[PDB]
UniProtKB/Swiss-Prot annotation, chain B:
The encoding gene: DPP4
Extracellular side: 1-726
Protein name listed in UniProt: Dipeptidyl peptidase 4
Annotated effect of mutating residue 712 to E: Inhibits strongly homodimerization, dipeptidyl peptidase activity, interaction with CARD11 and T-cell costimulation activity
Post-translational modification, as annotated: The soluble form (Dipeptidyl peptidase 4 soluble form also named SDPP) derives from the membrane form (Dipeptidyl peptidase 4 membrane form also named MDPP) by proteolytic processing.
EC class of the enzyme, as a word: hydrolase
Function description: Cell surface glycoprotein receptor involved in the costimulatory signal essential for T-cell receptor (TCR)-mediated T-cell activation. Acts as a positive regulator of T-cell coactivation, by binding at least ADA, CAV1, IGF2R, and PTPRC. Its binding to CAV1 and CARD11 induces T-cell proliferation and NF-kappa-B activation in a T-cell receptor/CD3-dependent manner. Its interaction with ADA also regulates lymphocyte-epithelial cell adhesion. (Microbial infection) Acts as a receptor for human coronavirus MERS-CoV-2.
Glycosylated position list: 47, 54, 112, 181, 191, 243, 283, 482, 647
Catalytic residues (UniProt): 592, 670, 702
Outcome recorded upon mutating residue 112 to A: Does not inhibit dipeptidyl peptidase activity, interaction with ADA and homodimer formation
Other comment: Level of plasma concentrations of the soluble form (SDPP) can be managed as a colon carcinoma diagnostic and prognostic marker.
Subcellular location: Cell membrane; Apical cell membrane; Cell projection, Invadopodium membrane; Cell projection, Lamellipodium membrane
């Protein structure tokens, strides 16, 4: 009677979630990439028109992986020869297609191996980075104007982030910000001169006779960090002079006193930019508000205008200080910060007033500010039903904070408890995306009265297909520990019978501000383990987890590898005492940070776990990068936090691995959690004579995501788990 | 009833073979390092005396790992701070102890980080290499004299070998040869300026925050090779202000025409040195015989004096041209070369006569020339009983080749069929070392009438211990394939009963000139697998194997990865048809070349094998070094043998691994077979969706020999084999 969701179904994507990715081009229309052609849609009525034919670029000779239309609709940037670099960065070739002449531009082309390109927010100016230097094109076909000359590979970065800034602060390769109407181009510059290099072998295709050594400026905990400078250049002055002057905006004095980071840049108006800076000891940040001085040509940041944001119990922000959302005239802004109770809420600032006023409050948190009009501020929070793993869209009246309306809570409470949103240019319309607990649902709405214009995609096709397979169910609930409630989730085998005893697999991440217990609908490895192997796959959000206030989130401050580890063990103890858990068959696994916690758990000697798998785990904090590591652990020095850095390694627990079955997996070209980390774990296990299972993945990185490797690792891990569980 | 030989027994060395390592110091006495003190023994009678007390160096503050006594007995070189490099190279600190003053010398000490040191063959002169340059000390306490100034790390090597010459041609780090009485010091210079570098991470102790990248000049097949020059300096013409002049000896001409190697250097007299050169296409070599010209100060090598040694069916030599053994007057010499039938035998040469005369012949081979006197030539061969895996010592009368005497054959035919030998300085005495098939046995003899003076060590203590454990037995026999007989051996479980069906593990190496079927007694992993797990562990010597003639050895010429692989599959088929082998439980495993063969067999789709383990395998010949690879494969160019280089990779067979259980093991710091080789196998397997087991060993090299990793690898492999064999 009906098959189950099998490993091959997971690895071959037989059941696919349908999406609806649109791109707003104005306050009334959006583009909808339709594999073959790209159409333009009128939000009001739903009618469309082809914007670009699928055959428009047939005899290009190059497969196009993406495009970007200029804001004024006159040009289309064609991206090809895509070559991935880190999590966000990549290089590529670009051609520009004129839409009014319907001709590809052939003169003054963007160079090959370009690192980043972006249209101005209005019109059709272009700014790109090539060979670590910035270039600006006023017209697509005319010569570029070079803005920087200091660009040097692995050394000086203009307009793009170095490794640690890409991964840990901006979550982007780009380090340039056009002003609202395109007049000014602002950019950061990184000096990695004294940053040490992580080096590792890349084997490449079998044809390469000698392996290549990859080398990357990467600051490990406590090592020399990149330094940064910020500049603003007036692009409108490029005809008139040669070598346009880049005006530098420097430090707030309270930052210059030592190592610091640029963590946020947000343009407020055509002549006002705000910058947030953060000290290397990440519990103090400052926001500067800088105005262009028309008769000086400078950018001045009034000291009375600065805003300090700090924390006494931890670091600043969830992963960094939040971004401001300025009003029209840029004289005020809203920002999510931790209130006096440790809960992140929106507060209202006046640019020259030291104190801000909170406009939301309660024992829940605002996830993010989504849109701001003269009338309302739109935001997502987990307020509904008191569930930290749910997400809904709310709107608060700016003239009366008493008028808070939830726009998504009630649309379909049964199927939808987790939403994200995309507003049109002036917030006239918005697309709501529901991701769980039922199948994804995309709808379009008009902001006037919040009416739901129509259903964009409801995955009805996947729904028909799934009723023919025994799919698992998912319970989201909580347990109480020392008067505090902690949430957990369980992917339950089909026809779950609490009368029976099921083997259990603890799927963990548990890094700071993480959340593994939510209402999102997923089709992943756990779906298969529960559906086909009848294994319960649980996750627990303990101390250190996010979106529930700083009391819980900062509990691991300066103490990584302690409570978040203990709380996972306790959770497994609690689960086992629920009655439907086979005590003798409890396992644990995790990937990055989750691999670390898994290994720490397995070496705890708790006796609770029979076996476990760690994929690309951190093994000692001194091996990971400075920005992420120090944010939670401070510095690795006698003076500050070296004792705990040395007390929380996986290596020191090697001996206890004699009690469990361990599978250690790592990609050899992991630029993020270096193969080094697992190479040291394996060496310590060998040194104490502990037998374990291993698998390296040649040339895979932190995601072990190439098509073949992804299939191979989940296959190898499925065999290990069924063996450990005495089942097929 | 009695325990078996277990895994722990093997890993903890509970049963230890006893040895008798002596060091001849003259034609009448030898030193015997006793793990406390070192004594000196009189060969004739067997009486001894302490030569150095065990407490002579207590408050040194340094553990001494070795020492060397000057040929004149006046000094003792003390080696400490030993830091291993490759298979033979290493660096160390040295101090010289004066024996007549019983004082450690404190001035003009040998530098720290010294790379090589060697007393002159007579007296007490010293030649050492520090920072890649040669230095000479006429007296232990006086300043040294710099001989070379060109030494540069990874770059110019004077008196020491670079990576590939250390591993593949000289099997040593030393590249200097003192003349007989210490007058001249000959040396080579290895120029690696265009040799590419192999680079790999080294993680070190957990304290190291960032991994270090090790880089070694290493020519992979077909890459730019190091170049070499040969010099001779007169150590007697010393100077406080003078660079001694190094006289260079250049190439034959037939060598200078292309890439070549210096493969052998043997001093013939006080003023005659012979040198053998090999072309990069290793099927042609030339011996030069050079004499010092007293009135020129030069070394001339008369063209009419050179000897050419070549092969039409393969390369020259077993792994390289054999070395010559010169007569007293250096006007004639004996050398093992392949005769017209393909069998290696001793040939007698006159330095200015082109043709040589064979003094031994037959379908067996001379393994090596061990000693030469005016009277006789002593050698080891596998002639006895026609068994190629047996070794015995013979002597042939130089005046009458009809007088050939076997000196070891009959001593104890039951216990001893494999010997090595160590003669005193003038060959007045010799120590025979029997290594199987029974327990090792060391005896001492006098060359006069070949009397066996006495038993030095007979392992009677291990014998008593072993009778209390169920030890496996060993069968050495053969099978015939196409009219040719090929040898094999089986380590048989205790109480072997050919009525039962046993799982079988094929233990393979099979590289060119290899021999895995012999009469040597061993206590290893196979002993445990047979004794405790009841697994038959077999080995087979097929095409390409050595010591049986060029017809069999050269069969794989330019064809590595073909017949030696097929022959292992065929042997496994034959074994299964013997009746006592369980067909459903046949596995195979090997290390290095054996790992390559194991992987090729497992990827053949023959269906014969259920599972296998490859340790540090070669996976594609373009990844291994030039000297070894090109010896059997020629060059990887379309004009030469590129097609076969590309057809013999393990990766091309990825798909067929779907049928077997495979365990792939490699050390991450392997400087010999780079981790790269296994990294490419694992990647080809992943690309075709084949599951397999793997294990990398952090910071281990080709030997995966550190105490903890050795134990770990064998424990992991044992679990894998038992799982595969229920
Ligand atoms: C080890 O081997 C290296 C490579 O063969 C040697 O090197 C190099 O040195 C020679 C010096 O003559 C250079 O010769 C060229 O330059 C001169 C003048 O410009 C010309 O007259 C001549 O015709 C050549 O064009 C080589 O360019 C140079 N090759 C390199 C750098 O690889 C090296 O000297 C040798 N080491 C020792 C100690 O001998
Ligand atoms: N380097 C780390 C980066 C990181 O934690 N984040 C950035 C990328 C992915 N994440 C996000 O983008 C994201 C998460 C949360 C928020 C928010 O609530 O404000 C916003 C963005 C989660 C944080 C992840 C990481 C941690 C490890 F401990 C590790 F060993 C490897 C890693 F890749
Ligand atoms: N590099 C190779 C060196 C090698 O084959 N020899 C040198 C060291 C050990 N051997 C010997 O010393 C030796 C072997 C034979 C003889 C003789 O009969 O003349 C003399 C010495 C065997 C040859 C071994 C090797 C081969 C591989 F294919 C590989 F993947 C790794 C290796 F280390
Ligand atoms: C969607 O439909 C509207 C309504 O018909 C289109 O707007 C009309 O465009 C035509 C031009 O062909 C004019 O004659 C009308 O006066 C327009 N009426 C308006 C402004 O409502 C609109 O172009 C369509 N949009 C898309 C993207 O197809
Ligand atoms: C103005 O443009 C110039 C010329 O294109 C830039 O000057 C060069 O900059 C590099 C440093 O990256 C120097 O090595 C050259 O010597 C400079 N030559 C000059 C002065 O033309 C210059 O960087 C730009 N202006 C400023 C202040 O950066
Ligand atoms: C884009 O913004 C810039 C900067 O505010 C505008 O340029 C200024 O225009 C005002 C006129 O209203 C002048 O007083 C200033 O001298 C200009 N500043 C300069 C020269 O940078 C520009 O008008 C805006 N673009 C558009 C089309 O609105
Ligand atoms: C920001 O973090 C640093 C480090 O935790 C705090 O300064 C340290 O405070 C502790 C007290 O718990 C002392 O032991 C150290 O000597 C201090 N080190 C210094 C002054 O560098 C600092 O106070 C924190 N700031 C806030 C707002 O709490
Ligand atoms: C030494 O080996 C080389 C390479 O095999 C021999 O030269 C090649 O001989 C083959 C014939 O089988 C030809 O196809 C090639 O064109 C030859 N290449 C050359 C001339 O370099 C060479 O003859 C061998 N020497 C001996 C003694 O047999
Ligand atoms: C291109 O567009 C046409 C017109 O609607 C459509 O029928 C066709 O399927 C598209 N081709 C591709 C490659 O999807
Ligand atoms: C980029 O490289 C291509 C070769 O693929 C070459 O034809 C072209 O001229 C280069 N320049 C640009 C901007 O495409
Ligand atoms: C980068 O910093 C280095 C090292 O501290 C200094 O030499 C250099 O001037 C800086 N580079 C630039 C262009 O600012
Ligand atoms: C509750 O407090 C006890 C007592 O210190 C401790 O053992 C336990 O780990 C705590 N649990 C939580 C959720 O903090
Ligand atoms: C050598 O020194 C060791 C060290 O304890 C001692 O046991 C042994 O008896 C000594 N042997 C002689 C012959 O002095
Ligand atoms: C060894 O013993 C013999 C026989 O008595 C004796 O003549 C000889 O001198 C001894 N060795 C030495 C060098 O004293
Ligand atoms: C190295 O050896 C030299 C030469 O004898 C000596 O003076 C020096 O102290 C040694 N170095 C160390 C660090 O022991
Ligand atoms: C000996 O010759 C070398 C090679 O030119 C030279 O560098 C060195 O200085 C000479 N010896 C001395 C001490 O001058
Ligand atoms: C060593 O040989 C040289 C050169 O043949 C000779 O001049 C010298 O006398 C010999 N040394 C001795 C001690 O016989
Ligand atoms: C024996 O003959 C067959 C057929 O010619 C061949 O395939 C096999 O490889 C041969 N074996 C040997 C040792 O030559």
């Amino acid at each position: 009677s009906r098959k189950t969701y099998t490993l091959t179904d997971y690895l071959k994507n037989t059941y696919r979630l349908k999406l609806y990715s649109l791109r707003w081009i104005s306050d009334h229309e959006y583009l909808y990439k339709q594999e073959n052609n790209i159409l333009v849609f009128n939000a009001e009525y739903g009618n469309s028109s082809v914007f670009l034919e699928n055959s428009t670029f047939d005899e290009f000779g190059h497969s196009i992986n993406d495009y970007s239309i200029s804001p004024d609709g006159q040009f289309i940037l064609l991206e090809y020869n895509y070559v991935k670099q880190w999590r966000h960065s990549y290089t590529a070739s670009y051609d520009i297609y004129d839409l009014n002449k319907r001709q590809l531009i052939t003169e003054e082309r963007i160079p090959n191996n370009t690192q980043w390109v972006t249209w101005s927010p209005v019109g059709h100016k272009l700014a790109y980075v090539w060979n670590n230097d910035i270039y600006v094109k006023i017209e697509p076909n005319l010569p570029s104007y070079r803005i920087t000359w200091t660009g040097k590979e692995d050394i000086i970065y203009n307009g793009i982030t170095d490794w640690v800034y890409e991964e840990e602060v901006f979550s982007a390769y780009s380090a340039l910000w056009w002003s609202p109407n395109g007049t000014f181009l602002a950019y950061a510059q990184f000096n990695d001169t004294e940053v040490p290099l992580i080096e590792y072998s890349f084997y490449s295709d079998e044809s390469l006779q000698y392996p290549k050594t990859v080398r990357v400026p990467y600051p490990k905990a406590g090592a020399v960090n990149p330094t940064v400078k910020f500049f603003v250049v007036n692009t409108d002055s490029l005809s008139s002079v040669t070598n346009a002057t880049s005006i530098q905006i420097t430090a707030p004095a309270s930052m210059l006193i030592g190592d610091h980071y640029l963590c946020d840049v947000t343009w407020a108006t055509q002549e006002r930019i705000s910058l947030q800076w953060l000290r290397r000891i990440q519990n103090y940040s400052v926001m500067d508000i800088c105005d262009y001085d028309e008769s000086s040509g400078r950018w001045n940041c009034l000291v009375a205008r600065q805003h300090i944001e700090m924390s006494t119990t931890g670091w600043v922000g969830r992963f960094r200080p939040s971004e401001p959302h300025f009003t029209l005239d840029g004289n005020s802004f809203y920002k999510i910060i931790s209130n006096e109770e440790g809960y992140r809420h929106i507060c209202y600032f006046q640019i020259d007033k030291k104190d801000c006023t909170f406009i939301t409050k309660g024992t829940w948190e605002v996830i993010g500010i989504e849109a701001l009009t003269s009338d309302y501020l739109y935001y997502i929070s987990n307020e509904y039903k008191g569930m930290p793993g749910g997400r809904n869209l709310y709107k608060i009246q700016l003239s009366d904070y008493t008028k808070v309306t939830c726009l998504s809570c009630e649309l379909n409470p049964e199927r939808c408890q987790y939403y994200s949103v995309s507003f049109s240019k002036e917030a006239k319309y918005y697309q709501l995306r529901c991701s769980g607990p039922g199948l994804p649902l995309y709808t379009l709405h008009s902001s006037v009265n919040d009416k739901g214009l129509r259903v964009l995609e409801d995955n009805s096709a996947l729904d028909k297909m799934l009723q023919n397979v025994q799919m698992p169910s998912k319970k989201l609930d909580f347990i109480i520990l020392n008067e505090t409630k902690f949430w957990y989730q369980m992917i339950l085998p089909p026809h779950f019978d609490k009368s029976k005893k099921y083997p259990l697999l603890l799927d963990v991440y548990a890094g700071p501000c993480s959340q593994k217990a939510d209402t999102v609908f997923r089709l992943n490895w756990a779906t298969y383990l529960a559906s086909t192997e009848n294994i319960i796959v649980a996750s627990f959000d303990g101390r250190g987890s996010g979106y529930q206030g700083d009391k819980i989130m900062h509990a691991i401050n300066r103490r990584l590898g302690t409570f978040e580890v203990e709380d996972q063990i306790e959770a497994a103890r609690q689960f086992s005492k629920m009655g439907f858990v086979d005590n003798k068959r409890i396992a644990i696994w995790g990937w990055s940070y989750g691999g670390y916690v898994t290994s720490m758990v397995l070496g705890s000697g708790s006796g609770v776990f029979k076996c476990g798998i760690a994929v690309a785990p951190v093994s000692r904090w001194e091996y990971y990068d400075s920005v992420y590591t120090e944010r939670y652990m401070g510095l690795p020095t006698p003076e500050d936090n070296l004792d705990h850095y040395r007390n929380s390694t996986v290596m020191s627990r090697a001996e206890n691995f004699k009690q469990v079955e361990y599978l250690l997996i790592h990609g050899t070209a992991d630029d993020n959690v270096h193969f080094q980390q697992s190479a040291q774990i394996s060496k310590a296990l060998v040194d104490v004579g502990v037998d374990f299972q291993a698998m390296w993945y040649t040339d895979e990185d932190h995601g072990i995501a190439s098509s073949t490797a992804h299939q191979h690792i989940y296959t190898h891990m499925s065999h290990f788990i069924k063996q450990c569980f005495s089942l097929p």
